[PDB]
Ligand binder design. Structure first.
Ligand SMILES: [Zn+2]
Lengths: 344, 89, 62
RNA sequence: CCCGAAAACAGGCGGCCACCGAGGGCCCGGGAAGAAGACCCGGUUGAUGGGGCGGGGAUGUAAGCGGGAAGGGAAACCGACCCGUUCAGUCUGCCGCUCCCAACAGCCCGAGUGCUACCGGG
RNA sequence: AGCCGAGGGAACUCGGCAAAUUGGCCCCGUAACUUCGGGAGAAGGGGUGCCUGCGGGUGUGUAACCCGCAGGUCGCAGUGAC
RNA sequence: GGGAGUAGCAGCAUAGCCGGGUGAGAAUCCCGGCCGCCGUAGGGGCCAGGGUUCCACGGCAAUGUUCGUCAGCCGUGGGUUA
């Protein structure tokens, strides 16, 4: 006989359209630094730089070529604190506290906002939460966040999410949260330059596709091409078992999947659309803008390589949950050149 | 909306329905596009297109209608229904 | 980070782009784009094309 | 890492309505999505599509006018091509500013009844 | 049912199936073998546009159809498509 | 009866649009213009064979692979001179 490995992976099945456009983070890393474990933004475009290699391995100490993805990140607004307790099987929500004066555009997502809810009641509810957290029935604390697209002119309907906090304790977490609620978070207060990140997003749509493109099936011989069966597979299976198995390549939806990617290095965090190299202040937006995305105004991240999704899509980053043992240092690498030329 | 008597210049983009249709059926589609565009933008309930506009569209055959037409639109009120008359410019 | 110079249309092009062509005799050529390279190996004359610099170098020799 | 409240113990939290009306769909302008359905952003608390003004890009220096041209013809004049006016002209399924035209006028689905056997207040 | 495909060039297949290559005209030059009639368009090579002109054949012909040469110039490409 | 309001009404010649009319009613009937196919035949003529299919007026139950105010369909009246 002849052997080869099967065509495609059974680890990303069922290959179906994502339940939502906003991604979902299922697991969170073990960090000791008490801080928010992630941030969110909108993707703008790609370009390239030249930098002196800091990462272990030959090519270290030389000038190389590095492609880069720019992620636009205006500040977030913290509007909630949420407690969790332990039930029979797993965690379960216990209490929520919201802030009172929320933007007029949050009701584009959450139509049913409360009516009286002044600062009196806000502070009373906070106090109740604290008297609960000092008891012992509490397992972890998380923050509720919403984005502000009105600043960059992208849209008005916002995105709402729930992020976790670092640390083994809950009262330190509550102090952090109680200090942060009602205000804005910027990315420099949370993310460091040089960290490894995991990026999380929803991929581009390709539509209904066949098995040649969707699983890697080999095109058939030219006689079958002239017979009407070239981009088809040959067999749906054997005679016994007398049913089709789920492992047989078929056609269907390709793209718009919820994906994750490990270990992408954050290189630079900028302020107001400009990158201040050691020497001088510079812009990142190229001549003529970015294709399919305009000009960058607020704040942005440089990410080494590629990430999942189309341009104006919502991305979510977290610190690496699966890092190696030989890490590159945490500091902005020496950058010698950044491309501002036309990308269209 | 646009006042009846006063005549307005509109630019109809036909580059939009190209590649929506086979090549040999682009001018017959461009005609209907002109009609609907002008109705929508004049708030008109009837439209009357000129032999001159038609012969402009078909100047080159059924495969290469102009990418942008430039027309003059003048409106009439009769029985409480708006009626556009379209000419060239 | 050196800006290199096209051997067909004479302009400076940025790091991370272009091509180097090596002849078996050791002589080298730099190309900014696919167009300049194809026109070179095809045989076109950059001295008649007003978007190059050979054009001005010839405008002198007129 | 991917799927996953139809997990029949068919979940937890916060908030809004019910005991006219909370919410939703059709409809309108579009695509970052798409075989039909679904999905996403916007709808005058407005830059969603078009236009006009500019930026960037692709080809490669428009027609007309003026001068030259191997050679020919008494002469007037012919004459492929070349130079200048000219990084020009044409185009833009790309970005930005600007209410000049159009996102109007509307129409429908919609929970709302109770008893003994009760749990904890009355 | 059709058009193009970098780098390699039949590694595909029972099998170079299918597709591609060549392709008109003028000049040069053309083997083995041969029933001396052929093979033979063997093979292999060069040329080919537009413009300005000069000559030749038949003819009474600044009517008509044909045959040779120089110079200038444009293009990736001159049997430019068929 | 279910199959099923499904297949087929693609492939060899991919052709319609603006304006006007008639009419109860018009993608498909008439007039004009634009755009197109054939073009040593899809043009022009005429055997055999068919037998009234020819012409005008009036019609739309059925036929016409859709509609139809159209028709080689239906009705009435005519028409072939050596
Ligand atoms: Zn060049």
């Amino acid at each position: 006989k002849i052997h080869r490995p099967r065509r495609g992976s059974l680890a990303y099945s069922p290959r179906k359209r994502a339940k939502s456009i906003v991604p979902r983070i299922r697991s969170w890393p073990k960090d000791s630094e008490v801080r928010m474990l992630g941030f969110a933004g909108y993707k703008a475009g790609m370009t390239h730089i030249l930098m002196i290699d800091d990462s272990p391995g030959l090519t270290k100490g030389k000038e190389i070529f590095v492609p880069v993805t720019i992620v636009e990140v205006p500040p977030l607004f913290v509007y909630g604190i949420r407690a969790y307790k332990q039930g029979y099987l797993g965690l379960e929500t216990a209490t929520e506290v919201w802030f009172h004066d929320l933007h007029k555009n949050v009701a584009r997502r959450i139509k049913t906002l409360p009516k009286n809810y002044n600062e009196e009641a806000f502070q009373a509810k906070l106090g109740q939460l604290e008297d609960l957290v000092n008891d012992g029935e509490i397992a972890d604390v998380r923050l509720l966040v919403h984005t502000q697209p009105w600043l960059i002119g992208l849209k008005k309907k916002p995105e709402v999410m729930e992020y976790a906090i670092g640390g083994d304790d809950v009262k330190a977490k509550f102090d952090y949260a109680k200090e942060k609620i009602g205000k804005e978070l910027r990315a420099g207060e949370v993310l460091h330059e040089g960290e490894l990140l995991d990026v999380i997003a929803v991929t581009k749509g390709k539509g209904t596709q066949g098995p040649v493109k969707r699983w890697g099936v080999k095109v058939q011989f030219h006689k079958a091409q002239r017979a009407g069966k070239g981009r088809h597979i040959g067999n749906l299976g054997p005679w016994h078992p007398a049913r089709v198995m789920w492992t047989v390549p078929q056609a269907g939806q390709m793209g718009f999947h919820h994906r994750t990617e490990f270990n992408k290095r954050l290189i630079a965090i900028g302020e107001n659309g400009k990158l201040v190299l050691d020497g001088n202040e510079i812009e990142i937006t190229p001549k003529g803008g970015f294709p399919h995305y305009g000009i960058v105004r607020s704040d942005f991240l440089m990410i080494e390589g590629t990430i999942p999704g189309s341009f104006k899509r919502i991305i979510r980053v977290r610190p690496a949950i699966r890092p190696p043992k030989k890490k590159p240092p945490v500091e902005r690498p020496q950058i010698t050149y950044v491309s501002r030329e036309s990308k269209q | 909306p646009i006042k009846p008597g006063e005549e307005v210049i509109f630019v109809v983009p036909i580059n939009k329905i190209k590649k929506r249709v086979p090549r040999w059926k682009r001018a017959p589609r461009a005609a209907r596009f002109v009609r609907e565009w002008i109705a929508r933008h004049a708030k008109a309930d009837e439209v009357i297109i000129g032999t001159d506009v038609n012969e402009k569209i078909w100047e080159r055959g059924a495969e290469k209608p102009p990418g942008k037409l430039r027309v003059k639109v003048v409106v009439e009120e009769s029985e409480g229904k708006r009626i556009a008359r379209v000419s060239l410019a | 980070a050196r800006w290199n110079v096209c051997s067909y249309c004479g302009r400076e092009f940025e790091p991370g782009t272009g091509k180097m062509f090596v002849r078996n005799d050791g002589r080298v050529l730099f190309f900014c784009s696919s167009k300049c390279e194809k026109y070179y190996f095809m045989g076109r004359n950059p001295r008649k094309l007003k978007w190059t610099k050979a054009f001005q170098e010839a405008r002198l020799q007129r």
